[PDB]
Amino acid sequence: NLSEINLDVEGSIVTVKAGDLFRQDGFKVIAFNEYFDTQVDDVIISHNSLNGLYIDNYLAGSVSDLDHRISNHQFEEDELLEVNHKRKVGKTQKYSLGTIFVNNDYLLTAFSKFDDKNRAFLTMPDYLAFLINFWDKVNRIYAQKSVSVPIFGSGITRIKEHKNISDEDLLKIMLWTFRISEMRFKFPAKLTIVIHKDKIDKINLLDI
Amino acid sequence: NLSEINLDVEGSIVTVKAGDLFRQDGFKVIAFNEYFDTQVDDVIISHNSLNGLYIDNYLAGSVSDLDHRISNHQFEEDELLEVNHKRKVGKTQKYSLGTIFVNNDYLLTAFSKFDDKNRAFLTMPDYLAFLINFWDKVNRIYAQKSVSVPIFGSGITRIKEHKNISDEDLLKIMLWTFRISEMRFKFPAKLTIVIHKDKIDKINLLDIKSARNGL
C-alpha cells in the first residue's frame, strides 16, 4: 500500500514511483514507433498511448515542425535503417530501436515496430534489445542526469508470444536490463520509473 | 561450499548444480557457432571449448558424417541465414542464433558469431536474443524432457562491451530469460544448468534465488 521505493542497483539509486510521467522534472521518455510516426488517428498512433498524448496535449509547437526537425536531424549511421517504400500510410524511414530524438526535455525513442498485420508490436528479443540499447544510450549520454520513463511495452504493444505479460514483469525486465547496462558505467543516468498513479494496485513495490 | 540448488521458476523446478555436462542423463546442449563449424584446430573451433571437446571425444561417427547430416537437414526458413562466400576458412552458411541441430542425445546450437578473425563474440542483445529463442525452442520441442546446459558464454566468447562479465551474472541472465520463456509454456523443459565442478568457486548459489522471481 505504498507508492515509491528507492533501489540500490550496482551502486546507484533507481526510483520507482506512482505518478504522472508528464509532471516529472528533467528528461521524460516518450515511446514512438520505428518510423517516428506522428499521425494520431487511433489506428497508427492511439490517442490513449503516451505517444498520442504527448503529441496531442504536450508537444510544444506543431506536429509539422516536429516532422521537419526529425527529418532534417542527423543520426549516427548505426541508427538509420531501410526505407519501407511500399507503405500505405505514415513515414517511410525506419530507425533502429532505441534511437533517440531529443525534443526539449523529452527523449522521443523508436520503441515499437509497426505493420498493418500486427500494428504496434515487438518480439521479446526486440523488446530486450530495445532496453539494452536504450539504457546504454542514456547512461553514456545522460550520465548523472534525471531520466524518467514509463513501463515500456505495457500499453497496446503486442509483445509477440507474450500478449498477457503483466506490468510488474515488464518492470522487472526493465530493471535487470538496466542493471546490465550500467555495469559498464561508473556514473549512469539517474533513472525514475513511473507507474501511472491509478495503477499502483497492479504492482506490489515490495515484490522489488 | 554449496554445490546444488533446486528453484521453483514460474511453477517449474530448475536445477543448478556443479558437475560434468557430459555425464548428464538426457539431452545435453553444446554451443556451436553460427556456421555450425566442426573443424577443431584452434583456428576455427578450439580443443578447449565444449564445442571442440564434444567433437574430439564424444561425437558419434566422423566429423564428415556430421557435416553432411547438417547440410542435408531441413532447417526452418528463418533459421537459415545468408551465405558468407568471402570466408577463407570454415563453413560459409550462416545460421540464426538459437538454431538447433539434434544429434542423438546432444542438442547442437548456433550460439556465437565469428568475425573476420574467427573470434567468438556476441553483443549483449545477441546474447539475450539467443537465450529467448533457444529457451522458446526447447520448451516447445522438448517439453517435460530433461535438458542440461552449461553457463553459455562463460567460455572464450567475448560479449561485446561486457568483457569481464562474471559467470554468476551470465547464470542469472540465463535464469531470467528462461523464466520469461516459460511464462508462455505451462509444461516447459526440465532444465538443469551445470556449473563445471572446478568452477563452483566462482558462483554463490545463494545470490541466485532471487532470479526465480525475475529479480
Ligand SMILES: Nc1ncnc2c1ncn2[C@@H]1O[C@H](COP(=O)(O)OP(=O)(O)OC[C@H]2O[C@H](O)[C@H](O)[C@@H]2O)[C@@H](O)[C@H]1O
Ligand atoms: N501519465 C502517465 N504517467 C505514467 N504512466 C502512464 C501515464 N499514462 C499512461 N501510462 C502508462 O504507461 C505505460 C506505457 O504507456 P504507452 O506508451 O501508451 O504504451 P507502450 O509502452 O506499449 O507504447 C505503445 C507503443 O505503440 C504506440 O504506437 C506507440 O508509438 C508506442 O511505440 C502504460 O501502462 C500506460 O497505462
Ligand SMILES: Nc1ncnc2c1ncn2[C@@H]1O[C@H](COP(=O)(O)OP(=O)(O)OC[C@H]2O[C@H](O)[C@H](O)[C@@H]2O)[C@@H](O)[C@H]1O
Ligand atoms: N564438462 C563440462 N561440464 C560443464 N561445464 C563445463 C564443462 N567443460 C567446460 N564447462 C564450462 O562451461 C562453460 C561454457 O563453456 P564453452 O561452451 O567452452 O564456452 P561458451 O559458452 O563461451 O561457448 C564458446 C563459443 O565459442 C566456441 O567457438 C563455440 O563454438 C561457442 O560458440 C564454461 O564456463 C566452461 O568452463
